[PDB]
Design a protein around this ligand. Structure first.
Ligand SMILES: Nc1ncnc2c1ncn2[C@@H]1O[C@H](COP(=O)(O)OP(=O)(O)NP(=O)(O)O)[C@@H](O)[C@H]1O
Ligand SMILES: [Mg+2]
Lengths: 64, 144, 260, 775, 98
């Protein structure tokens, strides 16, 4: 799971289905109450996630 | 009559290749297909590189058609692997790599060709006629 | 060398299945009858507007579609009105009084059955809480675990009280006396519609409990109404309609049984 | 607000929908829940899951995206008809009228050369149908083109065929304005529907509270814009199964080769979803632990990382430790090479039995078997799953098979429609008498047919109902070897013994002499009818005159029964619907019977029956787009090169295929994405089979390019234990040969019965394989 | 024998074509004896091919007698040009290829 955005209640990524369901269930009202994210913020988050994946792959390849 | 070298064969207009049996007539089809896909030969090369779906192959029997399709697939795969490794154990692929300018773009084109090999235009005469009639029923004037 | 095929230690099970009520069971009077006439009669009410008078042209087009004689067109229209204006259970609801917002036609429902449904363990309760079941012999069917399907004809709410309406076009008899209360009950017992409307009520109760916040069975439920089309006559209010309310204890025990 | 929900698996999205429905309840009880699905199986699965979770699922509408958007049009804007005037069915009959009036035009010159040699308007009708389909596709995906064509201008930088397509559409609109039909169609209605809700101060009345879009991974951009405009007033929950966790649409080739090759359908969709301004999205994924080969591949796909080693470096190419260890006992992904489809199904049955025995938790409903073409494998599947003994019996249900409720009645009626053209061969008429309904109509018993066979044979009836039929074919009138000749001969033989002699140059047929000859009187009643109708159907008639034809023919030629009544009603309904579309299109000109017959033939077999998709037994069905349901065991058959993917080339004059844009759909990409959906949906075991060698000629076949790329990636990403010293290529070939299983050609081959994982379960061929029988 | 044939008729009506022929071959041990007999392998292959063709033809044909009628018709006029009706390979072993 990406480290960025873990604190945000929106993200529900987990290790099993039940954990994801509980993570979503506990913070449903918080997710609904939050205002919509801007397009620039969404693109920034996706770019950060892609950069994190790239850095992880680079570190692994250096480990080989 | 002149001896034939697949790399130096110019591909423009009509060209006739006649030879005795077991001389590798069918085997030269793969080399010419690879040349057309990569656009190699300089002056003898086609003006622009082409795609799998734009190269027509006409065979006599269905079994030979399937054999040729499979062999072209295998040759494309081997040439892509050679381009990725920049080395090869076959003399034909070695000469090809010697002729190739940029191997990364060539490998990308070969990858696209490998992915579009399902749509390879290798038919028989009757199948070619049928497919041209179906695809162009409007111009030919037949039914859809 | 020695050759031997393998054997199966665990037998595969066909317990899981999806079945309907039919699988578990297994002048207007002289109008033609059958599967297709019945489906045509039902499709008529499927797309019929209750709050407006019947149109002769629409009836004529429907008879052309079905292929019946045009002679029925003058009479059938009137008969349809006889259905629309016929009174109901003591609240006195007329079908024409139902607006498009307070009606739901042909509702399809899915009911899960977790533990295998045994005929013996259910027939006893149904006979205990229903006299019609006591009159009939015990239910007989194989164990079933899975889903249960069904198509409810009509659901409508009046005075904040919901109802269940089921159309039936079976030719009980040639005379109107064959459509009386005792005769209608005998027909229900013969065609085993008791279990049918019981399952319909269980489905409706579960749906209302799911949808309606702070729902109560006794408060919001109004009963079950079987409408016999051919039985409907302007002369006799009772002939053609049948009304029955399932016991709340039966519904609760049935829900608990089907849940586990 | 329009909220997009992303999840690697479907169950998470379904549970999210469950929780959302439970949390926020609909105020009105009778208000139906809205869930958009493009397939019936998806809706059925959603219903079965929601009923299992809540206790009951009811009042849940499942409309298609187009129908839903049209319903929203009806409610938001006034003065809109219930059904659009511009539809695929009506535009065909409208262009059928419009095209002859425009042949004089110069722009249609090519069309003239097409429409020169037509006799019964076959070419005209087919061209009208194709142009109607093209115009519908344009309406859906290309509204700007139609907007430009209506004004009369041309689109710059477009296809060559536009020259003959732009005016026709214009000539269509004006035409539908002359008849008085509603002008409104969805293409012009899109902008007004968006603008009305964009400037709306408050929510318009009558709109549903919330909407769900589940199981749909492909939508046109215009529908997405409309849903974005509608999201302000009412909430829309898009459940999108995303195979990749990270952003994989137009990555800033994708990182994974198995995803880049097969992800063209989803790349455009995720790129459109990301381009939505008023969208708030939360990621709900589920990580997969790489404990199995299938789980390893799914994790590689999900994490957007590449595991295969190219081997560019000599040090990398030498050692094989870079790859991942593959357990030999592991059998999550297994490829199987068979000879015939019969052998393929027979091996699949044994493999399913082995999988059921291996895992107690597994159930038959979890297993699913998808074939390229279900009709080709239906007989083999049915025979193999039926021949299994009771102790070995596996329940099955076949879905997506062609709907054949009563085939003989349908075929008999279709043949009766071809009466004017038929030569009335004796065998053909006996084939019509084969149907018990047509014989009961003329009280021809089954025992009487055994007599009428030898009677027709010996009497000399060969062809032709009468001498007039013979003269109609411009053939010399003979007077013998016709139905009239044979009938007169049999009647004379019933009247006069053959010993007497000829009366009118016709020898009496002595065989039919007793009361049995009454059969003749019935047979002669059939042919006379066959005569009358064969004269009535010749002349062309307007559409309104064709209305009572079908019903009259049915009630004359057929005597209905409990089973056949359904088929007769279906025939009447299809005929009436076709003629009703024609009359709504106001086609004045006469229509030949050969057109309506060939239209009914196409309309009758277009039906499919998928009502047993999730009945409970194992599911047999073809690969249908937009149907992605998770299953424990996923089997794939018929992957021979050329059979899958299924290729349907464009008409050739379509303008969309010339300059494609994002969101354009193609059957090739559809199948390529369905192969990825099948891979991702597999939870426990993936089974893939294909024909390697032809059973007849012992030739060599090839598998699909998809299976080839899959096995290549597998062989390049894994290595067997003990092969570390070997190089990349040898280890790859070894893995590929270890996973590919080559089954025997015959069931009685003893290799099948040798002890091992490949051991069969069928004991019937055990004594034959053991060679213990006596000669 | 009459009883076993009557049971075969029931199997034929219920489960189709292939199940009846399979049960018959199993009970009568036809495949074993054919494989034992010299040359009977080609016989068994032809029988299996005929069974597959009969199943394919009975799938479309709903009547049980119609399949016998179709089989008799095809026996009367065999179509050599038909690819389906082409005889399959005798054995997968080494064969001199004429
Ligand atoms: N340049 C080559 N290098 C290596 N092997 C070759 C070459 N050319 C042909 N062969 C081999 O020669 C054999 C026959 O080649 P083939 O292409 O069939 O000749 P051919 O002209 O087609 N004979 P025919 O089809 O009867 O006219 C095959 O095994 C090929 O692999
Ligand atoms: Mg050759």
């Amino acid at each position: 799971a990406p480290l960025y955005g873990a604190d945000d209640p929106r993200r529900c990524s987990g290790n099993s289905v039940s954990e994801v369901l509980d993570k979503f269930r506990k913070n449903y009202d918080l997710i609904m109450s939050l205002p919509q994210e801007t397009k620039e913020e969404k693109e920034f988050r996706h770019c950060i996630w892609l950069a994190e994946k790239e850095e992880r792959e680079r570190i692994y390849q250096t480990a080989i | 009559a002149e001896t034939l070298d697949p790399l130096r064969l110019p591909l423009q207009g009509e060209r006739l290749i006649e030879a005795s049996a077991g001389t590798g007539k069918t085997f030269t089809i793969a080399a010419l297909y690879l040349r057309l896909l990569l656009g190699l030969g300089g002056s003898a090369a086609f003006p622009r590189p082409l795609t799998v779906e734009e190269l027509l192959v006409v065979t006599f029997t269905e079994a030979a058609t399937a054999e040729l399709r499979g062999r072209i697939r295998s040759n494309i795969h081997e040439l892509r692997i050679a381009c990725l490794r920049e080395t090869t154990d076959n003399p034909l692929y070695e000469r090809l790599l010697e002729e190739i300018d940029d191997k990364a773009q060539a490998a990308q084109w070969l990858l696209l060709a490998e992915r579009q090999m399902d749509e390879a235009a290798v038919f028989t005469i009757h199948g070619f006629c049928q497919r041209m009639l179906n695809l162009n029923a409007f111009e030919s004037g037949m039914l859809f | 060398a020695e050759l031997n095929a393998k054997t199966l230690q665990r037998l595969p099970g066909d317990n899981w299945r999806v079945t309907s009520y039919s699988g578990l069971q297994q002048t207007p009077h002289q109008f033609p009858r059958g599967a297709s006439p019945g489906t045509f009669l039902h499709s008529l009410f499927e797309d019929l507007d209750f709050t407006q008078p019947v149109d002769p042209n629409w009836v004529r087009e429907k008879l052309e579609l079905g292929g019946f004689e045009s002679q029925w067109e003058p009479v059938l229209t009137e008969w349809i009105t006889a259905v629309l204006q016929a009174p109901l259970n003591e609240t006195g609801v007329s079908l024409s009084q139902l607006s498009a917002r307070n009606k739901q036609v042909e509702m399809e429902f899915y009911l899960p059955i977790s533990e295998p449904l045994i005929a013996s363990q259910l027939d006893t309760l149904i006979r205990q809480f229903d006299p019609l079941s006591a009159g009939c012999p015990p239910l007989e069917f194989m164990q079933v675990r899975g889903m249960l399907k069904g198509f409810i004809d009509l659901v409508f709410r009046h005075e904040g009280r919901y109802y269940l309406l089921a159309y039936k076009s079976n030719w009980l008899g040639e005379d109107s006396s064959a459509y009386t209360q005792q005769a209608m009950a005998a027909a229900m017992q013969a065609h085993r519609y008791d279990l049918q409307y019981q399952l319909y009520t269980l489905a409706l109760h579960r749906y209302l409990r799911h949808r309606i916040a702070d729902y109560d069975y006794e408060h919001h439920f109004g009963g079950v109404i079987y409408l016999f089309l051919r039985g409907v006559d302007k002369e006799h209010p009772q002939q053609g309609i049948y009304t029955t309310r399932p016991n709340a204890g039966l519904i609760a025990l049935m829900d608990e049984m089907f849940a586990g | 607000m329009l909220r997009v929900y992303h999840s690697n698996r479907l169950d998470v999205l379904e549970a999210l929908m469950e929780f959302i429905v439970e949390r926020e309840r609909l105020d009105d009880p009778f208000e139906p829940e809205m869930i958009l699905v493009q397939s019936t199986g998806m809706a059925q699965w959603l219903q079965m899951t929601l009923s299992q979770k809540f206790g009951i699922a009811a009042n849940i509408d499942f409309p298609l995206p187009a129908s839903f958007i049209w319903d929203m049009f009806v409610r938001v804007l006034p003065e809109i008809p219930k059904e659009s005037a511009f539809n695929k069915q009506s535009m065909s009959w409208k262009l059928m009228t419009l095209l002859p009036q425009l042949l004089e035009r110069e722009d249609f010159t090519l069309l003239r050369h097409y429409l020169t040699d037509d006799s019964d308007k076959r070419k005209l009708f087919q061209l009208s149908s194709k142009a109607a389909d093209l115009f519908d596709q344009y309406l859906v995906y290309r509204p700007d083109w139609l907007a430009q064509w209506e004004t009369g201008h041309l689109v710059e930088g477009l296809g060559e065929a536009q020259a003959w397509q732009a005016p026709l559409w214009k000539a269509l609109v004006e035409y539908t304005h002359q008849l008085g039909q509603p002008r409104w169609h969805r293409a012009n209605l899109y902008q007004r529907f968006i603008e009305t809700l964009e400037s709306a101060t408050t929510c318009p009345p009558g709109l549903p509270s919330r909407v769900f879009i589940c199981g749909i991974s492909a939508l046109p951009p215009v529908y997405l814009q409309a849903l974005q405009a509608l999201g302000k007033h009412i909430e829309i929950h898009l459940l999108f199964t995303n195979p990749c966790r990270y952003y994989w649409g137009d990555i800033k080739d994708v990182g994974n080769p198995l995803l880049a090759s097969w992800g063209k359908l989803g790349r455009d969709y995720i790129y459109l979803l990301s381009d939505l301004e008023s969208s708030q999205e939360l990621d709900a994924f589920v990580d997969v632990t790489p404990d199995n080969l299938l789980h390893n591949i799914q994790s590689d796909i999900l994490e957007l990382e590449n595991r295969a080693v190219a081997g560019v470096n000599i040090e990398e190419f030498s050692r094989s430790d870079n790859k991942r260890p593959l357990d030999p006992l592991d059998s999550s992904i297994t490829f199987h090479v068979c000879h015939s489809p019969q052998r393929e199904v027979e091996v699949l049955h044994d493999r399913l039995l082995a999988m059921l025995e291996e895992d107690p938790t597994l159930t038959p409903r979890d297993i699913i078997v998808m074939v390229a073409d279900i009709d080709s494998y239906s007989p083999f599947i049915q025979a193999v799953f039926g021949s299994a003994p009771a102790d070995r019996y596996l329940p099955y249900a076949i879905s997506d098979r062609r709907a054949r409720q009563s085939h003989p009645v349908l075929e008999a009626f279709i043949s009766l429609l071809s009466l004017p053209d038929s030569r009335f061969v004796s065998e053909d008429v006996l084939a019509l008498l084969d149907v018990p309904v047509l014989a009961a109509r003329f009280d021809i018993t089954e025992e009487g047919l055994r007599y009428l066979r030898q009677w027709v044979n010996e009497s000399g009836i060969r062809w032709g109902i009468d001498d007039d039929n013979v003269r109609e074919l411009e053939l010399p009138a003979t007077g013998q070897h016709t139905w009239r000749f044979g009938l007169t001969r049999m009647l004379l033989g019933y009247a006069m013994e053959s010993a007497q002699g000829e009366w009118q140059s016709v020898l009496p047929y002595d065989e039919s002499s007793g009361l049995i000859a009454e059969l003749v009187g019935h047979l002669a009643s059939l042919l006379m009818q066959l005569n009358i109708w064969r004269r009535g159907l010749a002349q062309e008639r307007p559409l309104e005159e064709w209305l009572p034809v079908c019903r009259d023919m049915l009630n004359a030629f057929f005597l209905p029964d409990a089973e056949t009544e359904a088929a007769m009603t279906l025939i009447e309904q299809q005929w009436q619907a076709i003629i009703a579309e024609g009359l709504g299109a106001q086609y004045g000109d006469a229509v030949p019977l050969s057109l309506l017959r060939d239209e009914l033939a196409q309309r009758l077999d277009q039906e499919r029956i998928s009502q047993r998709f999730l009945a409970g037994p194992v599911n047999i069905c073809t690969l249908m787009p937009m149907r992605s349901i998770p299953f424990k065991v996923v089997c794939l058959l018929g992957m021979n090169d050329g059979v899958y993917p299924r290729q349907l080339a464009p008409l050739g004059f379509d303008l969309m295929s010339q300059k494609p844009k994002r969101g354009d759909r193609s059957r090739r990409d559809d199948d390529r994405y369905l192969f990825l959906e099948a891979l991702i949906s597999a939870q426990q075991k993936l089974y893939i089979s294909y024909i390697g060698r032809s059973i007849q000629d012992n030739s060599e076949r090839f598998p699909s390019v998809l299976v080839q790329e899959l096995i290549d990636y597998i062989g390049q990403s894994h290595y067997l234990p003990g092969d570390e010293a070997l190089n990349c290529d040898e280890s790859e070939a070894r893995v590929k040969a270890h996973l590919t299983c080559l089954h025997t050609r015959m069931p009685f081959d003893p290799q099948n019965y040798q002890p091992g994982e490949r051991q069969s379960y069928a004991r019937e061929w055990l004594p034959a394989a053991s060679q213990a029988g006596k000669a | 024998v009459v009883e076993e044939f009557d049971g075969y008729r029931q199997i034929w009506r219920k489960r189709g074509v292939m199940p009846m022929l399979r049960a018959l071959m199993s009970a009568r041990n036809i495949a074993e004896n054919l494989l034992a007999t010299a040359g009977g392998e080609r016989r068994l292959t032809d029988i299996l091919h005929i069974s597959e063709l009969l199943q394919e033809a009975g799938t479309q044909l709903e009547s049980e007698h119609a399949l016998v009628r179709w089989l008799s018709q095809h026996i009367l006029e065999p179509d050599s040009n038909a690819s389906s009706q082409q005889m399959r390979l005798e054995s997968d072993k080494h064969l001199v290829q004429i």
